[PDB]
C-alpha cells in the first residue's frame, strides 16, 4: 500500500518528466538568437530616499507609479512621494520585525507583516486624519514573508509555516488556505489578471495556485536551494524565480518547464529580490553581493549592473508604468534608478 | 514648487524631525536575540527579568540596566529546522542562547543547535551569551547518581575539572565536574571557528537566579567594547 503509493508517485513523476522532455525541443536562446541583443544598460540614481533608521526589507510601488511604501526593522513603514522625495507618511509598527510590505491597488490601504505572524493592514485615507490599524489578520503559525493585495477587500499572504492564505478583509478569516509546500514560502506574485498567483518556497519549488478554487495548479522545480524571490511576467504566462543558488530561473506557465537560467559564474551570492520591467525584456535581480543585476530575459546575459548600495539589496520593485526601478537595501537607503537617454 | 508642494515639504520636514527623535532611541538601545530549546528555561528567564509581550510568534521584553535599554526577542512557536528568518537578526548586539543543562537526552541536540547557530553565515560577527540554565536540576540529578553522563557522553571518564574553574564553596565537586564538562562541550564548538570575529560568553544560572540582567549588561559592554576597538582602528 504505502510502498505502492510511493512507487506510483514515482511513476507519475517520471511520466511528468517524460512529457516535459517531449514538449522540450528548442531552448528559448536558440529561438531568440535572431533578435538584436540589448547593449550595455546604465541606470542613474535619480533620487535617494533618506530617512530610514536601519535595514529595509521590503517596498512596494503604488499603482499611481509615484507613491511608494518601505518597511524597515525600526518598526517603521515610510510612505514616500518618490517624485519629490517628500515623506507622505510614517507609520510606527507594533512589531519591529516586518519582512514584507504592500500597497493596495486602490491606494487606500497598506499592509505589513513579519515575525509577529500577524498581517497588519493600515487605512491610509481616514477621516481621523491619521493612520490606524484597519485590521490585524491572524491565523498564520509562522512568520509572514510576503503579502499582496488582490483588491481592497481581498489579500494574499505567504508564511513560514509552508502555507499561503487568502484573507477576506471584512471577515478576517482564511477564505482559502494553500497547503502544498514543504518548506518556508518567501515570495508570491499576483498575476496581472489576479485570477492565479505563484509563490516560491524553501523546498526549491515554486507552486502556482488559483485564488478562486484554491489548489496548486502547477509546480515548478529546478532550483538547487531555497527560492528567495518570485515575480510574474507582465503577460501573466510566465514568471521568474531567484534563489540562494545565485541563479535566476524563468518558468513558463503553458509549457510547464524551465526556460533558461540567468546564472553567471562570477557571482555566487544568493538572490534577494527579482522583478521584471514593463515590457518584460529586462529582469532586475538584487543580490547579497551588495548590488543588483539587469539581465535580458530572452538572451540570459547581463545587460547591466545597478551598483550604488553599500549593503545587500533586500527589495526591488518596478513601477506599474515602467518609469523607474526602486531598490531598497540594508543601508537604510531607497534608490530610485532610471534610464539616462 | 507651489504652495501645496511647500506644505508637503514642511510635512516631510516634520516627519524627518520625528525620525531623528526616534533614531536617538533606536541607537540608544541594544537588540538581543533570545534562542534556546523549548524546554531550556528561556521563558523562565524572560519572566524572571521582566514581563514579555506576545505579538506562536515574537515575544518582546524591554528591560533597562544602568540607564541602558536592552530589547530581548524570543521567537517562539516556530519550527527551528533552518531558522531562515535569522537574516533579520544579523545586526543584533548579542544572541542569548539558553540551554538546559539537566537534560542529557536533549543535550546533544542543544549542542548541535549551538553548532548551527555559531557557524551560521549571517551570524558570523554576532557574539553569543551562553546561559546554562537550570543548574539546580543538574546538581540534583548528578547528586542522585541514577543517571550517568558516561553512557550519554563517553569522554566524561577522561575529563577532569579545569584548574581555571571557580566553584561555589558549598557545592559538590562532582557537580563542578559535570557543569564544567558541559561548559567545555559548548566552548569546544565556540572556539572551533569563532577566533576573532565573535565570542561566546558562558554563564551558570538557575531559575531563581536574579542577576541575569547584570550578566547580560556586562557581556554587552564587552561586546560593544570589542566592536569599538575594531571600528575605531585600535584593532
Amino acid at each position, epitope marked *: 500500500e504505502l510502498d505502492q503509493l510511493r512507487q506510483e508517485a514515482e511513476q507519475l513523476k517520471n511520466q511528468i518528466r517524460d512529457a516535459r522532455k517531449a514538449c522540450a525541443d528548442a531552448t528559448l536562446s536558440q529561438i531568440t538568437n535572431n533578435i538584436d541583443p540589448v547593449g550595455r544598460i546604465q541606470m542613474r540614481t535619480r533620487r535617494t530616499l533618506r530617512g530610514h533608521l536601519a535595514k529595509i526589507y521590503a517596498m512596494h510601488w503604488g499603482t499611481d507609479s509615484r507613491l511608494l511604501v518601505s518597511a524597515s526593522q525600526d518598526g517603521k513603514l515610510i510612505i514616500w*512621494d518618490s517624485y519629490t522625495t517628500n515623506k507622505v507618511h510614517a507609520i510606527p509598527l507594533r512589531s519591529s520585525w516586518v519582512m514584507t510590505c504592500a500597497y493596495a491597488p486602490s491606494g487606500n490601504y497598506v499592509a505589513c507583516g513579519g515575525l509577529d505572524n500577524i498581517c497588519s493592514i493600515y487605512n491610509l*485615507k481616514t*477621516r*481621523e486624519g*491619521n493612520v490606524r490599524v484597519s485590521r490585524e489578520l491572524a491565523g498564520h503559525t509562522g512568520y509572514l514573508s510576503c503579502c499582496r493585495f488582490l483588491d481592497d477587500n481581498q489579500i494574499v499572504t505567504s508564511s513560514g509555516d509552508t502555507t499561503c492564505a487568502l484573507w477576506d478583509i471584512e471577515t478576517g478569516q482564511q477564505t482559502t488556505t494553500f497547503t502544498g509546500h514543504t518548506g518556508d514560502v518567501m515570495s508570491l506574485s499576483l498575476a496581472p489578471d489576479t485570477r492565479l498567483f505563484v509563490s516560491g518556497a524553501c523546498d526549491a519549488s515554486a507552486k502556482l495556485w488559483d485564488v478562486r478554487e484554491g489548489m496548486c495548479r502547477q509546480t515548478f522545480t529546478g532550483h538547487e536551494s531555497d527560492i528567495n524571490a518570485i515575480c510574474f511576467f507582465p503577460n501573466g504566462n510566465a514568471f521568474a524565480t531567484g534563489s540562494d543558488d545565485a541563479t535566476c530561473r524563468l518558468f513558463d506557465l503553458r509549457a510547464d518547464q524551465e526556460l533558461m537560467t540567468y546564472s553567471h559564474d562570477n557571482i555566487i551570492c544568493g538572490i534577494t529580490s527579482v522583478s521584471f520591467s514593463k515590457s518584460g525584456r529586462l529582469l532586475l535581480a538584487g543580490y547579497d553581493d551588495f548590488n543588483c543585476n539587469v539581465w535580458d530575459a530572452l538572451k540570459a546575459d547581463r545587460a547591466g549592473v545597478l551598483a550604488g548600495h553599500d549593503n545587500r539589496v533586500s527589495c526591488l520593485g518596478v513601477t506599474d508604468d515602467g518609469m523607474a526601478v526602486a531598490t531598497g537595501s540594508w543601508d537604510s537607503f531607497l534608490k530610485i534608478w532610471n534610464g539616462s537617454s | 514648487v507651489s504652495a501645496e508642494d511647500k506644505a508637503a515639504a*514642511e*510635512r516631510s520636514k516634520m516627519i524627518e524631525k520625528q525620525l531623528q527623535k526616534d533614531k536617538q532611541v533606536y541607537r540608544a538601545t541594544h537588540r538581543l536575540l533570545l534562542l534556546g530549546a523549548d524546554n531550556s528555561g528561556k521563558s523562565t528567564i524572560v519572566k524572571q527579568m521582566r514581563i514579555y509581550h506576545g505579538g506562536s510568534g515574537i515575544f518582546e521584553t524591554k528591560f533597562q540596566v544602568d540607564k541602558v535599554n536592552f530589547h530581548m526577542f524570543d521567537v517562539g512557536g516556530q519550527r527551528d529546522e533552518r531558522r531562515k528568518w535569522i537574516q533579520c537578526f544579523n545586526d543584533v548586539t548579542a544572541i542569548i542562547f539558553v540551554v538546559d543543562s539537566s537534560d542529557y537526552n536533549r543535550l546533544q541536540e542543544a549542542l548541535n543547535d549551538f553548532k548551527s547557530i555559531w557557524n551560521n553565515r549571517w551570524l558570523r560577527t554576532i557574539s553569543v551569551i551562553l546561559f546554562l540554565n537550570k543548574q539546580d536540576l543538574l546538581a540534583e540529578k548528578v547528586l542522585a547518581g541514577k543517571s550517568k553522563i558516561e553512557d550519554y557522553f563517553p569522554e566524561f571518564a577522561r575529563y577532569t575539572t579545569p584548574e581555571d574553574a571557580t566553584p561555589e564553596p558549598g557545592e559538590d565537586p562532582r557537580v563542578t565536574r559535570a557543569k564544567y564538562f558541559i561548559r567545555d562541550e559548548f566552548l569546544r564548538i565556540s572556539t572551533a571557528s569563532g577566533d576573532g570575529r565573535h565570542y561566546c560568553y558562558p554563564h551558570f544560572t538557575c531559575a531563581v537566579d536574579t542577576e541575569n540582567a547584570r550578566r547580560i549588561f556586562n557581556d554587552c559592554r564587552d561586546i560593544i567594547q570589542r566592536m569599538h576597538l575594531r571600528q575605531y582602528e585600535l584593532l
Partner: single-chain antibody
Amino acid sequence: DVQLVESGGGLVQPGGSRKLSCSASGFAFSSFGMHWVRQAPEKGLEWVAYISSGSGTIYYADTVKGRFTISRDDPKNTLFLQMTSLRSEDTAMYYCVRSIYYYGSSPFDFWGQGTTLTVSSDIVMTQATSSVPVTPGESVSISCRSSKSLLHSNGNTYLYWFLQRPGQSPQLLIYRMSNLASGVPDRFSGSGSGTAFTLTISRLEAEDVGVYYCMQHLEYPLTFGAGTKL
C-alpha cells in the same frame, strides 16, 4: 467626531481685542494645518489666516496683516485667533478650517460651525453667473474664470469648489477639478482648462440647494470668488 466647534464673538467695540476659539474633537489636530476664513453677511468668502502643522509657517491676509495673530495648542487641540483694533468690516461669520497637505489629500476637509462677530498682485475670481433656476431634475453647470491659469508644472490645478447650505456651514465638493470629496456623492463633477472652470451636476436634488463657491490655492493670498445662488 471630526467636528470643529467654535466659541467667542458677539457685539464688540472697535478698540477691544477679542479671542475667537475653535476646538477640534475627533481627529488628529497636531498633524493638521489650520485656516481662519471670513464670510461677510450675505456676501462671498475671503481667507483670513493660515498656520501650518507645528506652527512652522504662518501666513496672514493682506487686509488684516499686523493686527491679527494665530497660534495652536496641540495638547488641548485648540486654535484661537487674537484680534486687535477691530474694524467695521470684521462684522462677519468666521470659520475654522482644517487642512492636511500631501499627495492625494483633500486639504479642506471639514469647516466647523463658525461664530459671528459684530462690531458697532492677488488672484481674482470672476464667477459671472450668480442666479440659477431652482428647478430640480435638470443638469445645471456652474462656470468660473481665473485671472491667471491655475495649472502648475506638476499638473494639479489648485481649484476648490464648496457648497454652503442656507443653514449649515460650507462643505467641500471638490478639492481639485478632476477629483471628488469623500462624503460627496458621485453626482457632482468638475472639468475645465486654464482659467475656464466648470462644475457639472447630472441630477438635481432638494439637498443640493445652496451657494456655490470657488477658490484658488496656487497663491497663499487664497482669494475666494463671489458665490452663485441656485
